[PDB]
Write a protein that binds this ligand. Structure first.
Ligand SMILES: O=c1c(-c2ccc(O)cc2)coc2cc(O)cc(O)c12
Ligand SMILES: O=c1c(-c2ccc(O)cc2)coc2cc(O)cc(O)c12
Lengths: 112, 116, 116, 112
């Protein structure tokens, strides 16, 4: 699994479950083309977005729909979404920690 | 001023100085239009991006060039940039402070929103 | 002033107001001795805890009472407090800003250290 | 496993390996008694600190030796350690994200 996303909820102290995200790859004309997507599981994790053969070097964007998540909980959020943009050039775990008015994101980059 | 951005360096324990950023506003046709830009001062702050009159309702994007910042310090970071996207002023005018805390493989962003 | 603490609320997107905190300094015999205390203002800041003369070299602890803060807002948080422990002024006097960002099950703390 | 600690390195983008920590339980006389300890594995995780029978209600402190970790990497740290103090009253995952001048800690509290 070349790419995994994990999302946590800092208000409830839990995995952030059923959070939708899309992954985009930067095209030559500077636009973002959809590449993959999914929703986090009960453990707040999203696996299997891509394979090693498909996951080639490039600039990737993970757009996490944090707003819909907070809406479902009845809490006013600040951000429209959380966006993680990076050059891939390895095993990637993107972790996102969510609060209504704040988020943090980290990458744990491992050599398989 | 209604919009201010503060950037901190979590490796050096300092303001993140000379950090470039660009602000966009989502147009009627859904494209991102250039709104404002600047770089952080010696205190890591960027003031005077907009005015109360110009800063109307809408969806705004702040793209902070964190990669150039890390690169100038000799570090190859993970992120291309740090991006903050938010609806502003939909219940009337507010003052927004966007704070970003930077590490080479991680960033945190927070908003302090006050009613003037 | 050489030591300042700023506290923010990540749920409301606001300064964390009226947050109590106590500062300790490690004595020669390794016990924590009371150094200073106070609470955050309307801007979430606590100034005037110490002076350049009093704030000598040593190991300092800031215990921020985050639990009372969350409890007054009707929330049962995870942490008893947020604690910042650090050696100060060991290369000469510095100004320290301690920033804490609070959520019910998470907190982040950063230090901005500047040479006056 | 009633209690797990996970530590990440925000400078290197990796698990924080070989990080020592001690766990204390608050005694009746207000002092901290050692309860358990260990070092994070290659995956930055520390498992098996306690069992369900031993892990009774109380106030617990996890003292993470972040200073020794940064020292080993040749980077000047700000903090003496990272301290996580909480009332236990469930499955606990304490995650700590480390930078030289900053740390964040979150709890992911699960019902088994
Ligand atoms: O450190 C912060 C933070 C901040 C940002 C991200 C974090 O994870 C923690 C604190 C926010 O607003 C500030 C505002 C300030 O005036 C000074 C500061 O040091 C900060
Ligand atoms: O909490 C995290 C974080 C994390 C994210 C943001 C923070 O501010 C702190 C920790 C990173 O990787 C994980 C990885 C995990 O397997 C489990 C976790 O709980 C986390």
């Amino acid at each position: 699994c070349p790419l995994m996303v994990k999302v946590l909820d800092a208000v409830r102290g839990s995995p952030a479950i059923n959070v939708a995200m899309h992954v985009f790859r930067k095209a030559a004309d500077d636009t973002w083309e959809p590449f993959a997507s999914g929703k986090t599981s009960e453990s707040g994790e999203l696996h299997g977005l891509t394979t090693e053969e498909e996951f080639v070097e490039g600039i990737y964007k993970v757009e996490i729909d944090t707003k819909s998540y907070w809406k479902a909980l009845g809490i006013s959020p600040f951000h429209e979404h959380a966006e993680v943009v990076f050059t891939a050039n390895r095993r990637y775990t993107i972790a996102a920690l969510l609060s209504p008015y704040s988020y943090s994101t980290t990458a744990v980059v491992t050599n398989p």
